[PDB]
């Protein structure tokens, strides 16, 4: 609101907080990003290194949909199973009754292995998987089924 601003407090003080010597002029120093290499170089070299120049190779007509691949770590693998069914699967760790998890149906592309899963067999279906993620899954008695 206007009644809480410092403009109200500056009423009657001549300079309105802008100073008598320097004053409040229109555009001292240029507009926008002017003088980035001449009189604003120091503020660009620090706080913004890498601004000037080009590095990589171009890519004409890039479609982001080609690079869609959300990642899911093993420490959150069991969150895909609904809570009302997690408890019975944890206590009944056995073959011929391993739960099947469709990571693609949950909106994930690749399975990464970061955390630790319980020693319970599980059938994991995914498009991609890291080397470490598969090893931990098989160490618990599970298997990875590649899908498309």
CA distances from 52 to 4, 41, 43 (A): 42, 11, 13
Alpha-carbon span 95 to 89, nearest angstrom? 11
Site for Cl ion in 2-41 (CB under 5 A): 9
How far apart are CB 148 and another protein at their closest, in Å? 29
CB nearer another protein, residue 70 or residue 118: 118
Closer Cβ to RNA, 16 or 147, answer by number: 16
Structural tokens at position 140: 């618990």
Rounded Cα gap, residues 148 and 138, in angstroms: 21
Binding mask 65-104 for RNA (x = CB under 7 A): ----xxx-x-x---x-------------------------
The string of DSSP codes covering 44-65 is: HHTT-TT-SS--S---TT--GG
Separation of alpha carbons 133 and 142, rounded Å: 11
Which residue's CB is nearer to RNA, number 59 or number 96? 59
Over the window 70 to 109, marking each residue x when it contacts Cl ion by CB under 5 A and - when it does not, the resulting string is ----------------------------------------
Least CB distance to RNA at residue 97 (A): 25
Q: How many CA atoms lie within 13 A of 127 on its CB side?
A: 13
Interface positions with another protein (CB under 8 A) = 27, 29-36, 40, 43-56, 75-76, 78-79, 90, 115, 118
């Amino acid at each position: 609101p206007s009644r809480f601003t410092k403009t109200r407090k500056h009423r009657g003080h001549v300079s309105a907080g802008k100073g008598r010597i320097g004053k409040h002029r229109k555009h001292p120093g240029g507009r926008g990003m002017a003088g980035g290499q001449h009189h604003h170089r120091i503020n660009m070299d620090k706080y913004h290194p890498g601004y000037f120049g080009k590095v990589g190779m171009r890519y004409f007509h890039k479609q982001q949909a080609h690079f869609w691949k959300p990642v899911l770590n093993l420490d959150k693998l069991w969150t895909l199973i609904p809570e009302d069914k997690r408890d019975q699967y944890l206590k009944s760790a056995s073959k011929e009754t391993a739960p099947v998890i469709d990571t693609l149906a949950a909106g994930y592309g690749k399975i990464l292995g970061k955390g630790r899963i319980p020693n319970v067999p599980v059938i994991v279906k995914a498009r991609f998987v890291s080397k470490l993620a598969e090893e931990k899954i098989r160490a618990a008695g599970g298997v990875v089924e590649l899908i498309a």
